[PDB]
Amino acid sequence: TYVCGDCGQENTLKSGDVIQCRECGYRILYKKRTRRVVQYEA
Amino acid sequence: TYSIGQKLRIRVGPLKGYLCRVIATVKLDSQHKIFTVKSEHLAE
Amino acid sequence: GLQNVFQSFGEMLVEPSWRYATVKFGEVTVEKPTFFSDDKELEFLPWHARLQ
Ligand SMILES: [Zn+2]
């Protein structure tokens, strides 16, 4: 799941699609953080 | 025993309670050290 | 000052390689920057450029 750069929309990505926010058309997409747990020693 | 990609815990040692992931030989979640330990020193 | 480059560099006279031909560059306009996505035109702000 990637999230649109200029508006918040999320979509799965299909291989070979020019990356485009389907909804708005700008072409910058950012991956998203799942809930997975990470341990950092302090 | 275990399998590739499992999340185990370092039971006894200087590095205790750390969670780590078993590359093949475990690797820690956020530090770059590849340690190798026997089964007795690893827990779910 | 772009106009000036164009005010100089004047009317060409396309060579009879029986026919004349003249060319007369006039006013020059520059348009804000834009990007065409599919049919639509959207604004390009510098950042989008840097990242695309
Ligand atoms: Zn969008």
Answer whether B31 touches A (CB < 8 Å): yes
d(CA C42, CA C31): 14
Q: How far is the CA of A22 from the centre of ligand 1 (A)?
A: 7
Q: Is A24 annotated as a binding residue?
A: yes
- The helix or strand, by DSSP H or E, that contains position C37, with its residue range, turns out to be strand C34-37
Nearest to B21 by CA among C1, B33, C52, A21: B33
CB-based contact A39 B18, cutoff 8 Å? yes
Q: Strand pairing partners for C42?
A: C35
Answer whether B33 touches A (CB < 8 Å): no
**Least Cα separation, residue A23 to chain B (angstroms):** 36
Is there a contact between B22 and B30 (Cβ–Cβ < 8 Å)? no
Q: Which residues of C6-40 are buried (b: 16+ CB within 10 A; e: fewer)?
A: eeeeeeeeeeeeeeeeeeeeeeeeeeeeebeeeee
Q: Is A31 annotated as a binding residue?
A: no
d(CA A23, CA A5): 12
**Least Cα separation, residue A9 to chain C (angstroms):** 17
Distances (CA, A) of B31 to A20, A35, B14, B27, B38: 35, 20, 14, 8, 20
In the structure encoding, which two tokens stand for residue A4, read together?
A: 């649109």
Instruction: Residue A38: list chain B partners with CB under 8 A.
Output: 29-30
Give the resolution to one decimal, in Å: 4.3
d(CA B26, CA B3): 11
CA-based max dimension of chain C: 54
**Cα torsion at C36, C42, C45, C47 (round to 10°)?**
-70
d(CA C14, CA C21): 5
Nearest to B19 by CA among B33, B3, B5, B8: B8
